[PDB]
Chain length 194, copies 2
Amino acid sequence: EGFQKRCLPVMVLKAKKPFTFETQEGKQEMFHATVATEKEFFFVKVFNTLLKDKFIPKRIIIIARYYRHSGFLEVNSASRVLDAESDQKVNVPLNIIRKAGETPKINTLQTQPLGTIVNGLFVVQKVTEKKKNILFDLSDNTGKMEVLGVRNEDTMKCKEGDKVRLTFFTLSKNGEKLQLTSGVHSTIKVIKAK
Amino acid sequence: EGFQKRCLPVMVLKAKKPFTFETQEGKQEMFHATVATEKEFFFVKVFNTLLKDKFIPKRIIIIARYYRHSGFLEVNSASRVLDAESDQKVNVPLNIIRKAGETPKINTLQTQPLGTIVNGLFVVQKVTEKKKNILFDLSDNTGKMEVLGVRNEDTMKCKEGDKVRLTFFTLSKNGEKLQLTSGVHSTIKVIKAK
DNA sequence: CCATCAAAGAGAGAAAGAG
DNA sequence: GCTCTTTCTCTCTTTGATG
């Protein structure tokens, strides 16, 4: 249990819109964000839709009592989050900021540990429907890989030439033709072409 | 040039919510709109408010018996507007769309011919209230200009840091320190800062 | 420089709920 | 039985990040 009671200031790099995922307790609320310190950056799972007051790009927030998982962190109810005074510093150098927002290169993924959380905007080469799933074959200059997503309304419109924005996928394969899969909290958005 | 009785297809771009106004003849009604041909765009005074059937963005329409003034167009109850044939084209290039709808930069106005119509959302710098009007000194990154509008309820909601949306003001003075003036068909809306 | 995405803020139309 | 507000439903304008 990696719970961190200690506080921490963070410069919120990005916070996406809240979305619903059906799990157990019923419709769940959450969104995805990315934050930074002077040293490193992490991807966040924020389970309070109403915390969007706090997470705003370029905004600094002092976050207390957070869970800190494998490849990302977790801000939940048992936690607490507050604003910071003009007093707080926490300078994020460009390369951390820059690297925070980039879409990983496929070839870079073959070298990454599995469990690595992968977000990014990708180009769809082929797509093959399954019963409950969809196989998107995405490839950029560095090479190709494959991800298994969820079969539904908008991911149904996806075709060669479209792009997909993947969020909170996991690396389930590396090396030649690496693979990501869809998790509970993964979200994907289909960007039609031209 | 002058009254045009002839059929002109135009793409409706903007159309605003009708308002009421006064003359020596008493009360009147109208609304403001923006439409465009393939080559150019136009701001519209439509004084027959029933036209809100036809005037609606993205909708192609055809018009005759309207008037062509300096910087704008008049549509009276004596003209005619119609849903255009499925054959009609009116294919409007993005740069005209973008330019039809953008708030002009102040310094751009300094070089423009007087008798130009100006609409836009501007930042309010200072406000000196008069007896029959209010003098609004407005700014953007390009510079300053003064505007004399009407003194009233909503125009007096306005404070430094707020914004105002001006529709159909006319350029009175240009060059260094231009000024925009209110007229019968102008409108203004005050937006509270934050 | 320029093309693509994304999100907040403003505006309008139409819809649902309360005197 | 009917107007007057409160939502939402959608778009466009701006702006900022990304490649």
